[PDB]
């Protein structure tokens, strides 16, 4: 495949909410905010790792 | 402690403060100048010495100025609160143009410096305060009359409609018929004599021939009411005749359709699969749908169009007037809603389309 | 600078499209045909004015072949959608129009003349459909497959561009469907009422004659209107009842499959059974339709193999790899998953077929709006508008050099 | 799957903080755009301290480069025996048009006032024509058949029947 | 097997039909209408994504004020994340950090090459070729 980055996604967890929130992606809205772009997967019950030791 | 809701119509204005189950201040929405400026029952009094204007027409603004000066006397007057203290939040016509959010936002946040803001669409409102997750709703105000299908909360733009058939031409309609019987009602104190004669005594007829027939023949369709000189009129026939109006364009001398055949077919405009629950969820608002037994009347035709394996089903609660603003004065209460709102900051660093960002 | 106050309008057969820059759907929708009464004739244009029946009123419509051809009835339909809908001075917005692929030249010119001078608009702006439907979707280049109520047609578009020269054109569209539902209802001996007739209907049992009463106060109406109400009862029988078998139709294996219900404005009410799926055939095999024995029509799957097979190799990878499915037939029930299916099968494996999955009404049918809006959106796109001052000049001569 | 959209809320503990700033104002304003050559004015909104700051979006306005020539140049280096001055002067104004993208080129070429036209042709004659004009300006101090073979072997490849297709791939798995 | 694999390897021909040859290459920057396609392209997904949104926030509060209804009638007897998240700290990976796509930016010089869809001829060039 092509290969790019900026269409890529990948786990990530938020501070606030503190969770793994499964695959996200990174983009800019259309003034100035910033969103995330979340995929879906059908293991999203189980990603809740946090500390990863 | 709680925000504030509200509401602009084109005849009455309702505010007050959210988890509240009745709007605080309602009044009408006029603007006195000199021949400083008046609003409301003020300058109604002074409309003798006064000149007036509206605001609004159609359900949508058209002076800003003016409609500055009523957000003005509406928070510091009515309300009593400044502004800044409290979020405000804000009801919508169907199919408003965008430059209307735009200025109204700007004005909002930089005149009136309030701290978060959101705009709403009034139907919707209405269907909350139904409590029902899909519906049709039939929206008649003062000005304007529009039909809305909602799925799940999230309103159809293209199915929506639109009627200019409302409150205002029918008390002008009134006031034509009972002056044609042999009285005399020119200027604007008679024509508020012929509205509060049209909120008191008028009504829906369930089979408009019967009851023609009937008021022919019988006496027992026919009323008096007392004047402020203290003189007594008699009022026949035209009870029923003014509401019918909405059934029957004709006798305004307008070439449209009435409400029952606007509803089905923006039922009919929508998809083959949600037609069965507007059906089942057709909901009524607005001043103009509390004549009495306009239900029935509307479940009948309805009935007749629709086809027979369906199963139709009107919802008029009593209070259907104020549905409007108790929508908005529920959803602020709300928990979830909280995040929803459009913060100052927000707007400082986008600029007035962050509304059409976020307030939906 | 992505938010100038534009306009963008989108006409077609069926319907004409309008709303604003920016905008994430169309803000009105209403129907294209109109009623005009001679005696300059009168035009009654939206859906309210349209119901009510009236004499010597006739039925008709300004576009031909997706082309325009009545002006006058164009601009009262412009005049309509402006006072009305819109309810803003035109000359204040910049306007995006969307116009169709084979659109001549001098009607493009003539267009342009007529918003300048007549509407007084700031500035001005031409797109083809099939461009637009590729920005919607977000492509540069794909193959666009559209069977809207005239014509279905297969547009390659590279780098934007709309490659003329693989232009494909088949007649079978949404209208054909409603003359092959004619012709069944023929069949079947059904009659057909529309609403404005009946004044009230009773229940009847399944099958039976239909009972109900005629309007005595209705005023002679023509032809043509008459013959639109029936098309429009058969267009709400088409989106519901017909479906597209996922093989080949096979006429014992059809008859296992359960009927459906129906029922007509008059009360008539009967189940379809293999009728509702042997129609739908005639798009992927027109070769077997009764009473059309010429051969010389082409399927759309074949439409779409032979367009493609008409433009350059290098290019062909790209568009077999990105296909866009547009226009209201495809709505149609199973559509999908049989052009899908014919594709994958006919299409050589070294290509990798894929088929962008946008299967809702609301994009379906406004792809076109939706395209016209981001275009207009764009920051940069602001250095591409055809001004007043430019109109003075280059109004004729740089609105061939302007819109390729 | 969703999107979280940022926001400063879902409490009312910001009481504070926000009561003590102020907007900046925005506004309505006209603006100049470089790109466009007729001084159009378009309507903008922005802060209201940025008033008469140059279009950010004209530095996007980039173009291709591509060679010009007079009659007397025409006249010494470009004469070729193929083709006429018009058609040359027709292919290098669809180039300047459409930015060298020559399938759209060859599908705008007309091909009816001028001799049918396959693209590597274009591809040729324009590379030839650029590539003299550029060594006689400089200062004292492509390969047609090859494409034309690799685009012919492509067609010859496209045409497979499925059976060729599956006798290929049978001998293919035969040598592992 | 293998003198009628050398007649079958004869017979599709490396010499008729089997594997290609290379692709020619001229380099040329990017221009104008490149860098509107591009934004075309960010400007459809954010609209896309924009309206999919649209459509759960409304659910969600449909049934959250169902949901209230309800709890009134009883009683007779995710979709957002915080500033501080979205414009701060960058999600480094440890054992690099994670993209983000911003809009085209104009070039501050000429060295952004134009690239396209060729696919089939895989990218970059060819190092060792026979002696031509
Ligand atoms: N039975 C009735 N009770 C009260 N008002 C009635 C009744 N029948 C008709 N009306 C008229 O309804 C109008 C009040 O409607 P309402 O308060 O909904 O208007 P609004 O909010 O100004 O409308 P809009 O938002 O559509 O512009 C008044 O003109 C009143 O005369
Ligand atoms: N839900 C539906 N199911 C099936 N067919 C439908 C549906 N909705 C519309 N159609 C068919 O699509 C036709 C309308 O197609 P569309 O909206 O693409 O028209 P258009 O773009 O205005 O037409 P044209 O390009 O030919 O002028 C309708 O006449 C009907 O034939």
Redesign the interface.
């Given at each position: 495949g092509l290969g790019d980055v900026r269409y890529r996604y990948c786990l990530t967890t938020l501070t606030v909410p503190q969770r793994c929130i499964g695959f996200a992606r990174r983009r800019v809205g259309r003034g100035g905010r910033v969103l995330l772009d979340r995929a879906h997967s059908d293991y999203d019950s189980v990603f809740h790792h946090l500390d990863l030791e | 402690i709680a925000a504030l809701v509200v509401d602009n119509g084109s005849g009455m204005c309702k505010a007050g403060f959210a988890g509240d189950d009745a709007p605080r201040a309602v009044f009408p929405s006029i603007v006195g100048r000199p021949r400083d400026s008046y609003v409301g029952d003020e300058a109604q009094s002074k409309r003798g010495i006064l000149t007036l204007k509206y605001p609004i027409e159609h359900g949508?603004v058209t002076n800003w100025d003016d409609m500055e000066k009523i957000w003005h006397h509406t928070f510091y007057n009515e309300l009593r609160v400044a502004p800044?203290?409290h979020?405000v939040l804000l009801t919508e016509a169907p199919?408003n143009?965008?430059?209307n959010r735009?200025k109204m936002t700007?004005i909002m946040?930089?005149t009136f410096?309030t701290?978060?803001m959101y705009v709403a669409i009034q139907a919707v409102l209405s269907l909350?305060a139904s409590?029902?997750?899909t519906g049709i709703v039939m929206d008649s105000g003062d000005g304007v009359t529009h039909t809305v299908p909602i799925y799940?909360?999230?309103a159809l733009?293209?199915a929506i409609?639109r009627?200019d058939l409302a409150g205002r031409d029918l008390t002008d309609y009134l006031m034509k018929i009972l002056t044609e019987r042999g009285y005399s009602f020119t200027t604007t104190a008679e024509r508020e004599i012929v509205r509060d004669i049209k909120e008191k005594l008028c009504y829906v007829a369930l089979d408009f021939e019967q009851e023609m027939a009937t008021a022919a023949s019988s006496s027992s369709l026919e009323k008096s009411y007392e004047l402020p000189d203290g003189q007594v009129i008699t009022i026949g026939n035209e009870r029923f005749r003014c509401p019918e109006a909405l059934f029957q364009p004709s006798f305004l001398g307008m070439?449209?359709?009435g409400i029952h055949?606007?509803t089905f077919?923006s039922i009919?405009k929508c998809?083959?699969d949600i037609r069965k629950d507007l059906y089942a969820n057709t909901v009524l608002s607005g001043g103009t749908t509390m004549y009495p037994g306009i239900a029935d009347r509307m479940q009948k035709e309805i009935t007749?169009?629709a086809?027979?394996?369906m199963k139709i089903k009107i919802i008029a609660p009593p209070e259907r007037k104020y549905s409007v603003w108790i929508g908005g004065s529920?959803?602020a209460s709300?928990s979830?809603?909280?995040?929803?709102?459009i913060?100052?900051?927000?707007?400082?660093?986008?600029?007035?389309?962050?509304v059409?960002?976020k307030c939906? | 600078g992505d938010e100038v106050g534009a306009l963008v309008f989108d006409i077609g057969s069926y319907t004409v499209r309008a709303g604003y820059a920016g905008e994430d759907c169309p803000k009105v929708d209403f129907p294209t045909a109109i009623g005009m009464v001679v005696e300059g004739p009168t035009y009654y244009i939206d859906t309210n004015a349209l119901r009510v029946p009236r004499e010597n009123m006739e039925a008709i419509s300004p576009l031909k072949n997706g082309m325009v051809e009545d002006w006058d009835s164009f601009q009262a339909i412009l005049d309509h959608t402006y006072k009305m809908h819109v309810k803003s001075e035109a000359s204040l917005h910049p306007v995006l129009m969307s116009e169709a692929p084979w659109n001549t030249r001098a009607k493009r010119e003539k267009l342009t003349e007529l918003m300048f001078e007549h509407y007084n608009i700031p500035a001005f702006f031409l797109c083809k459909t099939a461009v637009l439907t590729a920005f919607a979707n977000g492509r540069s280049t794909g193959l666009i497959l559209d069977s809207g109520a005239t014509h279905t047609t297969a547009i390659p578009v590279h780098d934007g561009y709309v490659l003329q020269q693989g232009i494909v054109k088949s007649p079978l569209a949404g209208d054909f469907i409603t003359m092959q539902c004619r012709e069944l209802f023929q069949e079947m001996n059904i009659e057909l009422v529309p609403p404005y007739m009946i004044a009230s209907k009773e229940a009847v049992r399944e099958g039976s004659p239909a009972n109900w009463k005629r309007k005595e106060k209705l005023p002679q109406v023509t032809r043509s209107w008459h013959n639109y109400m029936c098309n429009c009862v058969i267009q709400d029988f088409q989106a519901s009842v017909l479906q597209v078998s996922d093989s080949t139709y096979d006429e014992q294996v059809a008859a296992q499959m359960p009927t459906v219900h129906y029922e007509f404005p008059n009360g008539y009410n009967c189940d379809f059974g293999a009728e509702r799926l042997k129609i739908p055939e005639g798009l992927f095999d027109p070769s077997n339709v009764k009473g059309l024995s010429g051969n010389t029509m082409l399927g759309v799957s074949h439409v779409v193999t032979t367009s493609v097979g008409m433009c350059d190799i290098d290019i062909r990878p790209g568009l077999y790899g990105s296909v866009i499915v547009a226009g209201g037939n495809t709505l149609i029930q199973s559509f999908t998953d049989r052009l899908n299916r014919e594709l994958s099968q006919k299409t050589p494996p070294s290509m990798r077929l894929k088929l962008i999955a946008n299967n809702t009404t609301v994009e379906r049918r406004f792809s076109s709006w939706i395209g016209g809006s981001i275009l207009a959106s764009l920051g940069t796109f602001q250095q591409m508008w055809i001004s007043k001052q430019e109109y003075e000049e280059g109004g004729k001569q740089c609105v061939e050099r302007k819109c390729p | 799957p969703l999107l979280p959209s940022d926001t400063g809320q879902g409490y009312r503990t910001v009481k504070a903080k926000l009561g003590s700033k102020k907007v900046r104002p925005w506004k309505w304003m006209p603006f100049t755009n470089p790109a466009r050559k007729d001084g159009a004015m378009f309507f903008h909104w922005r802060r209201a301290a940025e008033e008469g700051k140059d279009y950010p979006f004209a530095r996007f306005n980039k173009t291709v480069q591509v060679p010009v020539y007079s009659e007397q140049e025409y006249q010494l280096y470009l004469h070729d025996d193929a083709w006429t001055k018009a058609e040359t002067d027709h292919l290098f104004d669809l180039s300047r048009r459409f930015d060298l993208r020559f399938v759209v080129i060859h599908d705008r070429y007309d091909h009816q006032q001028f001799k049918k036209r396959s693209v590597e042709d274009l591809k040729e004659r324009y590379y030839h024509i650029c590539a003299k004009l550029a060594n006689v300006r400089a200062v004292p101090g492509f390969d047609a058949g090859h494409e034309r073979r690799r685009k012919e072997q492509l067609e010859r490849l496209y045409n497979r029947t499925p059976e060729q297709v599956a006798e290929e791939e049978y001998l293919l798995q035969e040598l592992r | 097997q293998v003198h009628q694999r050398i007649a079958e390897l004869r017979k599709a021909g490396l010499w008729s039909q089997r594997r290609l040859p290379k692709l020619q290459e001229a380099p040329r920057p990017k221009s104008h209408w490149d860098y509107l396609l591009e934004e075309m392209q960010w400007m459809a997904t954010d609209f896309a994504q924009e309206r999919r949104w649209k459509v759960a926030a409304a659910k969600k509060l449909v049934r959250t004020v169902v949901r209230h209804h309800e709890e009134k009638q009883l009683r007779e007897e995710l979709l957002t994340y915080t500033r501080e998240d979205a414009y701060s700290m960058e999600y480094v990976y440890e054992d690099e950090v994670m993209p983000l796509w911003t809009p085209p930016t104009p070039p501050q010089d000429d060295s952004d090459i134009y690239l396209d869809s060729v696919m089939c001829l895989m990218y970059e060039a060819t190092p060792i070729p026979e002696a031509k």
């Amino acid at each position: 495949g092509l290969g790019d980055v900026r269409y890529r996604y990948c786990l990530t967890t938020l501070t606030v909410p503190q969770r793994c929130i499964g695959f996200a992606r990174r983009r800019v809205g259309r003034g100035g905010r910033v969103l995330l772009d979340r995929a879906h997967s059908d293991y999203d019950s189980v990603f809740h790792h946090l500390d990863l030791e | 402690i709680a925000a504030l809701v509200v509401d602009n119509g084109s005849g009455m204005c309702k505010a007050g403060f959210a988890g509240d189950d009745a709007p605080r201040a309602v009044f009408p929405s006029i603007v006195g100048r000199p021949r400083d400026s008046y609003v409301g029952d003020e300058a109604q009094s002074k409309r003798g010495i006064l000149t007036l204007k509206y605001p609004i027409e159609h359900g949508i603004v058209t002076n800003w100025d003016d409609m500055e000066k009523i957000w003005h006397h509406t928070f510091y007057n009515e309300l009593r609160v400044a502004p800044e203290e409290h979020p405000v939040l804000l009801t919508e016509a169907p199919l408003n143009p965008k430059a209307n959010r735009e200025k109204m936002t700007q004005i909002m946040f930089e005149t009136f410096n309030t701290p978060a803001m959101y705009v709403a669409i009034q139907a919707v409102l209405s269907l909350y305060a139904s409590g029902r997750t899909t519906g049709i709703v039939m929206d008649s105000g003062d000005g304007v009359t529009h039909t809305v299908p909602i799925y799940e909360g999230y309103a159809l733009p293209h199915a929506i409609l639109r009627l200019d058939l409302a409150g205002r031409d029918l008390t002008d309609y009134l006031m034509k018929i009972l002056t044609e019987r042999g009285y005399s009602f020119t200027t604007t104190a008679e024509r508020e004599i012929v509205r509060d004669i049209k909120e008191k005594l008028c009504y829906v007829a369930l089979d408009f021939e019967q009851e023609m027939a009937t008021a022919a023949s019988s006496s027992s369709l026919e009323k008096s009411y007392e004047l402020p000189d203290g003189q007594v009129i008699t009022i026949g026939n035209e009870r029923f005749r003014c509401p019918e109006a909405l059934f029957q364009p004709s006798f305004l001398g307008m070439e449209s359709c009435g409400i029952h055949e606007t509803t089905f077919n923006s039922i009919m405009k929508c998809d083959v699969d949600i037609r069965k629950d507007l059906y089942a969820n057709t909901v009524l608002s607005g001043g103009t749908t509390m004549y009495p037994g306009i239900a029935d009347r509307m479940q009948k035709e309805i009935t007749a169009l629709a086809p027979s394996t369906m199963k139709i089903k009107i919802i008029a609660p009593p209070e259907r007037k104020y549905s409007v603003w108790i929508g908005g004065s529920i959803l602020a209460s709300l928990s979830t809603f909280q995040q929803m709102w459009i913060s100052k900051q927000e707007y400082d660093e986008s600029g007035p389309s962050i509304v059409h960002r976020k307030c939906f | 600078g992505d938010e100038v106050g534009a306009l963008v309008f989108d006409i077609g057969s069926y319907t004409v499209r309008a709303g604003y820059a920016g905008e994430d759907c169309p803000k009105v929708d209403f129907p294209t045909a109109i009623g005009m009464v001679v005696e300059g004739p009168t035009y009654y244009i939206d859906t309210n004015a349209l119901r009510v029946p009236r004499e010597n009123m006739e039925a008709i419509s300004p576009l031909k072949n997706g082309m325009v051809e009545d002006w006058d009835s164009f601009q009262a339909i412009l005049d309509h959608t402006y006072k009305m809908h819109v309810k803003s001075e035109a000359s204040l917005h910049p306007v995006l129009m969307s116009e169709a692929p084979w659109n001549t030249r001098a009607k493009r010119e003539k267009l342009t003349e007529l918003m300048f001078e007549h509407y007084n608009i700031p500035a001005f702006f031409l797109c083809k459909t099939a461009v637009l439907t590729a920005f919607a979707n977000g492509r540069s280049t794909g193959l666009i497959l559209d069977s809207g109520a005239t014509h279905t047609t297969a547009i390659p578009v590279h780098d934007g561009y709309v490659l003329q020269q693989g232009i494909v054109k088949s007649p079978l569209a949404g209208d054909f469907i409603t003359m092959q539902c004619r012709e069944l209802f023929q069949e079947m001996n059904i009659e057909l009422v529309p609403p404005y007739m009946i004044a009230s209907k009773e229940a009847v049992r399944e099958g039976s004659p239909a009972n109900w009463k005629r309007k005595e106060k209705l005023p002679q109406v023509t032809r043509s209107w008459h013959n639109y109400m029936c098309n429009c009862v058969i267009q709400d029988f088409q989106a519901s009842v017909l479906q597209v078998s996922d093989s080949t139709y096979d006429e014992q294996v059809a008859a296992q499959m359960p009927t459906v219900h129906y029922e007509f404005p008059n009360g008539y009410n009967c189940d379809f059974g293999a009728e509702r799926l042997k129609i739908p055939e005639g798009l992927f095999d027109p070769s077997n339709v009764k009473g059309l024995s010429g051969n010389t029509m082409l399927g759309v799957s074949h439409v779409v193999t032979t367009s493609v097979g008409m433009c350059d190799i290098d290019i062909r990878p790209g568009l077999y790899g990105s296909v866009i499915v547009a226009g209201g037939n495809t709505l149609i029930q199973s559509f999908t998953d049989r052009l899908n299916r014919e594709l994958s099968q006919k299409t050589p494996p070294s290509m990798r077929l894929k088929l962008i999955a946008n299967n809702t009404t609301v994009e379906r049918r406004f792809s076109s709006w939706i395209g016209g809006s981001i275009l207009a959106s764009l920051g940069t796109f602001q250095q591409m508008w055809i001004s007043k001052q430019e109109y003075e000049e280059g109004g004729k001569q740089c609105v061939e050099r302007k819109c390729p | 799957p969703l999107l979280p959209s940022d926001t400063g809320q879902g409490y009312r503990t910001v009481k504070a903080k926000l009561g003590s700033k102020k907007v900046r104002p925005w506004k309505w304003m006209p603006f100049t755009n470089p790109a466009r050559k007729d001084g159009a004015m378009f309507f903008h909104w922005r802060r209201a301290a940025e008033e008469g700051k140059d279009y950010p979006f004209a530095r996007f306005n980039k173009t291709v480069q591509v060679p010009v020539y007079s009659e007397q140049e025409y006249q010494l280096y470009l004469h070729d025996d193929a083709w006429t001055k018009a058609e040359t002067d027709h292919l290098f104004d669809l180039s300047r048009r459409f930015d060298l993208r020559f399938v759209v080129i060859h599908d705008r070429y007309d091909h009816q006032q001028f001799k049918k036209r396959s693209v590597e042709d274009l591809k040729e004659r324009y590379y030839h024509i650029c590539a003299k004009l550029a060594n006689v300006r400089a200062v004292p101090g492509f390969d047609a058949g090859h494409e034309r073979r690799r685009k012919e072997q492509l067609e010859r490849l496209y045409n497979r029947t499925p059976e060729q297709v599956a006798e290929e791939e049978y001998l293919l798995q035969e040598l592992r | 097997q293998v003198h009628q694999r050398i007649a079958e390897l004869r017979k599709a021909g490396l010499w008729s039909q089997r594997r290609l040859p290379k692709l020619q290459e001229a380099p040329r920057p990017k221009s104008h209408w490149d860098y509107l396609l591009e934004e075309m392209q960010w400007m459809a997904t954010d609209f896309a994504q924009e309206r999919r949104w649209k459509v759960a926030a409304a659910k969600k509060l449909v049934r959250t004020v169902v949901r209230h209804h309800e709890e009134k009638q009883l009683r007779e007897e995710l979709l957002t994340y915080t500033r501080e998240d979205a414009y701060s700290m960058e999600y480094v990976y440890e054992d690099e950090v994670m993209p983000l796509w911003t809009p085209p930016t104009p070039p501050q010089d000429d060295s952004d090459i134009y690239l396209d869809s060729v696919m089939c001829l895989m990218y970059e060039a060819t190092p060792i070729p026979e002696a031509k």
